Design an enzyme around this catalytic site. Structure first.
Site: not given
Ligand SMILES: [Cl-]
Ligand SMILES: [Cl-]
Ligand SMILES: [Cl-]
Ligand SMILES: [Cl-]
Ligand SMILES: [Cl-]
Ligand SMILES: [Cl-]
Lengths: 233, 233, 234, 234, 233, 235
Positions: B204, B179
């Site tokens: 994903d 992230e």
């Protein structure tokens, strides 16, 4: 097969292990807490024992001081001896202004001045995490025993005698609780090999307030921590 | 008021959810919250205050990357008295056993960002989640039956990276997902003495190629917001 | 084909584009300068528009704040949309002792505390350069308009709220003109992909003298900066 | 009197060409200047002052590499009041389509050197050429039919490098050529608030192996010397 | 012929002295050598070969700084078959007990140059003098009565340094003096398997401000070149 | 006054000291080469002895493995106990193609993996030097005893189990002889405190050829190495 620094036969070392630092603390742990104990290593006088605790086999292995020393032993335990759960029980120096001597710190992760991870991941700050299941067990059990438990980050230092303390004070100011010398190596290697690690440390002294403690003075805390580490393993 | 938020004093709650996308901040406020006010539309970076289960809570868009979220976290903390900050959103899994729909609670973050190397030259800063918040989310998620993974993440400073070798290696060393924000949140929260956490749904897998549509993962996402609200309140 | 953060149809984005950080400034530019405008993107509220200026189609795209945010949009505009000339517009904080509010800075290069080029060229200082043709067009148009235009380096900062200002003071002492948070990303990626970039910035305030301007106080300078960026771009 | 230059105060002009090789400084003095004195022979690092279109101008040999030119540039500025400094040199092309005899006017420099990392820890410092000198040289260079390019260069510490991997990658990000001084020159001029520029002919292509003879480069060198002399005196 | 030296094959001796100043090479050849030939005038970087105590030997100006000397050393080794390279010149003392006129024989060098970090990312490379050359030069110096000090030097990349605090700190850590070339010489000699040494006369002391004119230290300089020559042949 | 890791009284430790990593190796040295021996420490079981050798008091102290362990003991030895000459005796792995097992390396300097010195001198490569008088002494004594002595640089590593060997391989190409784990710490601290250090090392194995050696096979060479280190420390 034995590793280069441990003369143990394959199978002599339990899958669960305490890493109390000083080899004479390993001996203390084995004699005091364990039944049916074997000493499986005396190479470099780095004593390692396997005994039984609540009907389970479990090991206690002295490591030396610092990332390079503990990395050698941890590498060997995992890689040559199939060790799965590793709990460091040790001491630390408080670097945050309101952390107190006799506080017990459960290291969620570790900062470091070591280059070890820089070489492995050039250009990245690698932040190795504790195993959460071990950590939560330790937290819960330590809270039940009335230990002054804190959960947070520590600094793994290469240098015990540091000339400039400015930056460790600064880490203090960003909530880093204490300084010690092994945890980053232990957590990073456990992650590498997909095994479980935790550091549980008692504040033996405060690096800035000067507050200090005796080993007799830490004994009641230390004994509860070894029982916590053992149960968790 | 602050430079990037037009709220008046008292318009923003002590506890706040921090999605990246301001249209997700709207979705969350309209979906979960009662009596909602919109206190900010500067840069379209929507922020809202409402009630959840009778208790006052806010939701603020942060934008993408360390530098953007840093501006908002600094201003929320310094100008608006915010004390609990929970990043919510999605991530791309990079560890071999992590699956789409898993929710990651970051204990720490790795980064290729230079923000902490500048602050602590020669040190690896491992920023840490607030443990009390983290245990609350973990416990709420486990009670719900979510596959909650507690560990480290990579806060990437680049989305379109020229090679994936280093992120692949990090995943080989147990790093759960990637992230672009959490080291900023954790570091600033620590600096100011306030409480922070990141709870992220896996959308994903970066190496297996498992992917999921936002429609496909909507109820997992809703349950992530639920546990994050529970933990903050 | 749409990129991941842009929902535009192929051909909806012109080859020349202005890159403000604020998507509401993108909207202001479009409504203020452009005819026959279409809003081609609403994903994340990161508004993007195409319109016509002096008979030419030109686009305007919000980038967000900071290197990582502008780098996403810039990558997708170049790779997915064939954008060719990219002009960052916005404001900056002056750090050089002679720079004034309302001056317009055209960045020849950018210094940075971002790690972005250190992974790419380990051991090297990469100095990302503006496209000289664009730089020259904008400088000439700026000086014809009467703007106090300054050509030099800028700091692309990774941090808006900096604990110590010692280093940014030192950079200003070494002639670095102003601080902002995006241009090294733009210049590096433009260079990587062989396309043309420029940043042209209005000084909003001076970080060390304390001189400040309100957005209303500088609207006219900003609007004129936009005109010269549009002229350079098309 | 500085430690590496034996000139008396006032013997060195405000404006100076930096041709590198001391034998090029002597060439420039004798061929272009009138009423020339040699003000320095220490280390044989020859420096001259003469007149060009009625105006005094110096020409100072410097050595190879950042540390050598930093010595001479510091003493030039601090001890002798030099305000305008123009490196007239050569370089090796590292970009696939740059050609020998091309003249590169450096907007910035990338570097191998650690010089700026010590000064600005944790920062990439990107030093800027003086813009007025730069556009002057570009305009005059293009009027003379010189194969002018304006961009970035690599200032390298190492003429003989083991691996070319990274200098190839710098070429792919548009870096034109490799030389050994301009990051020092541009950085120190910025520091002292003075004006600097580098103008460099490609003598070789690092990758294709194309080379030139000193004689092949001469008509180009002579045009560059005139361009640098005019800019110096104006 | 190399690119910066115009000598014929065979015109440069296998043993060479490397002063920085070409006019100092001229002085050395004229003062110390018989049957001397000037073999290079490129860039006015004078090089000479002559005979000393019946032995052919060369002297070659290198200019100032790592990047200049590296050019010359590469070419002498790879194009001219040179085997022994001894840098001669002066240095600025920084250690508290080092005096003007002492002669420093560099065992290693520290540096603020990036040349070696670039080659060995993550590592501090410590270039070594050839021990044979070093012992020969030391015995010759002590036999002569010179105050020879063997230890480390700082190969500095800047002459005009903004701050002296770091070079002061190096002096406190026993670093003897500062110069601008030996890292380059020692690293390249070692890479090509040839023998290198630096023997330098202290011209001044950076921190005491004790200083010496070139005329005032001439005798010492001359004896330094004698011992370098003796060591080389 | 005792240091935090050594339980000796003031004056129990001699001014000259040998520093093996292994405490059982310190014991072997004391028992084998020393007369009138006293064990002055076993905190952490890191045994230290003082005895007499050729009419002179000399000490031997286990240091443990790695820069941080040896730094602790060396700090305390110098600062708490006034030690003046310090010689590391140990083994190393050869990384240079012509270095052979049973070679004894006398380290002029050390390269390193450690951030220890980068922290102290940001932006600088710090290269710490052996005490030359000790080094010259050891070299002469070792060549006289027919040891395969080499004088050069070594690599001080933080990691024993390295994943990639490519940089240490390259280091070897640049003439670095062998890899060990302590000497940059010993040389740096010695120089910092103005005292005298050396590392003398026997090659136990070769990192790239894989040639190995038994501790029996090393013993005649190690025994001589101990004697030359004692000789060099007391002179
Ligand atoms: Cl779902
Ligand atoms: Cl960067
Ligand atoms: Cl205005
Ligand atoms: Cl020079
Ligand atoms: Cl150890
Ligand atoms: Cl034998």
């Amino acid at each position: 097969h034995m590793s280069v620094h441990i003369e143990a036969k394959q199978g002599e070392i339990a899958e669960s292990i305490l890493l109390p630092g000083d080899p004479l603390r390993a001996k203390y742990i084995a004699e005091t807490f364990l039944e049916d104990v074997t000493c499986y290593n005396n190479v470099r006088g780095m004593l390692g024992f396997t005994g039984t605790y609540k009907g389970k086999r479990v090991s206690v292995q002295g490591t030396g001081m610092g990332v390079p020393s503990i990395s050698i032993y941890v590498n060997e335990l995992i890689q040559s001896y199939g060790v799965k759960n590793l709990i460091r029980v040790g001491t630390c120096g408080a670097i945050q202004k309101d952390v107190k001597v006799r506080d017990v710190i459960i290291a969620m992760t570790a900062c470091t001045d070591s280059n070890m991870n820089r070489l492995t991941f050039p250009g990245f700050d690698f932040a190795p995490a504790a195993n959460f299941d071990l950590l939560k067990k330790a937290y819960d059990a330590g809270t039940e025993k009335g230990l002054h438990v804190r959960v947070g980050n520590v600094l793994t230092a290469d240098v015990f005698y540091r000339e400039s303390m400015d930056m460790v004070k600064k880490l203090g100011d960003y909530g880093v609780l204490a300084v010690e010398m092994e945890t980053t190596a232990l957590y990073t290697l456990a992650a590498k090999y997909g095994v479980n690690a935790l550091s549980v440390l008692t504040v033996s002294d405060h690096i800035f307030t000067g507050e200090e403690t005796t080993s007799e003075e830490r004994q009641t805390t230390f004994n509860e921590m070894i029982e916590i580490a053992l149960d968790a393993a």
